Amino acid sequence: PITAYSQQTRGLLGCIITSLTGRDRNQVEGEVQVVSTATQSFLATCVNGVCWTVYHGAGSKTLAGPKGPITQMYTNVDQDLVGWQAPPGARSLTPCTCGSSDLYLVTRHADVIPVRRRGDSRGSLLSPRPVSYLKGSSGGPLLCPSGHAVGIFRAAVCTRGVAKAVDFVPVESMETTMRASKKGSVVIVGRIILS
């Protein structure tokens, strides 16, 4: 069912300047936004109109947006989780409600990697890959077979440079951060379309 492809929209130049100005008037499209500070790149996934990514990529940094920089609405260092108001045009994934243990991690290179959930915030890859297959995909989505968000990719367990299992912030942890709330900008340099 689940397939994906990537689209690069900027170079490092556009990125650098966008970061400095915090002003991105490119058209936002897709559910998964390929994201970057000037010095490191990772993914940001959208759920419930909020654009979620990891703190170990974003920091407390703002998001470059059409009317200037967007301050983080949510920030949870303990859960390695931040979130901005999703910019106009960005599609939002719906949270999973079926309880499927068969998860699908989508990577920055638009690979769809099977995972079996074996814990609340953790699961094993059905076939190990070199860690390069995952690196730079933090803040990417884990999807159930219906393509609903179960959680966002946070870390991976590896040995001898081969990743055997993953760690993610579940979608429930987001609801808990959301309720509990109640120099450079991060830049959208591409996206990953789903289906």
Next chain:
Amino acid sequence: PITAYSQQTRGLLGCIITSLTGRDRNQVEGEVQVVSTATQSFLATCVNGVCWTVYHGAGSKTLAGPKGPITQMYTNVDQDLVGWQAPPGARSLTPCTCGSSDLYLVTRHADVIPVRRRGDSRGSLLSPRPVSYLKGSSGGPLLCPSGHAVGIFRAAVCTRGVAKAVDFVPVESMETTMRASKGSVVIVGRIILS
């Protein structure tokens, strides 16, 4: 016998434009090229006129050339291998025929690390070093004592931040690849051998 030294030729700014334009009018020299996207760096080894490197660094990107960007001539994801037409000026290594297990790995820093081959695509360092010695040297060559290409550095077995063994695409897999068949990757430096 084997020795090697490095030469940088571009800054990151130079690299950024050369990447976007896709046009590199610099003089290509050496057998091993220090290569970079705008955002990561590794190596590319030339063998029999083909300029090889790793997919996990270069993706499916073109290579900035003196008459515009050059499209990958080979792309084997499963082996983590990509190849371009070697750009004019580059020198080319010849595959090893002597079957030696005494390999020698050349790094981006130009260190010549002795490796004992212990499998088709696998070998051990005679004395371990910190992973930082190797990191960024994917696409670099592993050389027999006579200075010929046996393979191409791909990944490393490390623990506690020290590298003990390596994994490399053998020069035969390249022959199999050859038989079967936004930004450009940029040459920002090179490594001269002897």
Next chain:
Amino acid sequence: APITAYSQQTRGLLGCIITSLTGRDRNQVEGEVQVVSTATQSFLATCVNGVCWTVYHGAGSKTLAGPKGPITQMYTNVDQDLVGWQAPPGARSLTPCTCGSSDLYLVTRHADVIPVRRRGDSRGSLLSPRPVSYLKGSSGGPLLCPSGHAVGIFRAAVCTRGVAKAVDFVPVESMETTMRASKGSVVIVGRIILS
């Protein structure tokens, strides 16, 4: 702890790049630990007795950008992963520790003050482990005793499964053994003030 810290960014990537090329940094220098960068990677440097020390695996044999142009290395020790420059005017200097305490504190680029238990000449254990990301990019940062004196600089970490448990450092002694025995410039892009 009597020891607390915060960081100040002073440059961005474009600013860093130019300054690397020129090797001329006219920015006013402050604090003991300097956030340091080549164009393509970033780490830390610590001042002890007028000498600004960092890791070779970050700086190599690069000059340091200075107010009257680039500063050649005063000490280089690749066996120990150690390099040092004359501390540029403005830079405050920590003092070597003499109490022989084993209750060390690692300071990171994100201004975290991590407890460590010295368990060897040049090695220690984190009192409570953390994800490796907490340490990455903090090489050349200070390990301090309870009195805020230097015992050594952060060099490497022992990790498994993405969690850092122990660390490896150059002792301050080894620097005194270096002191007796003996294209781009590295650029300061921020600092970390201690107390």
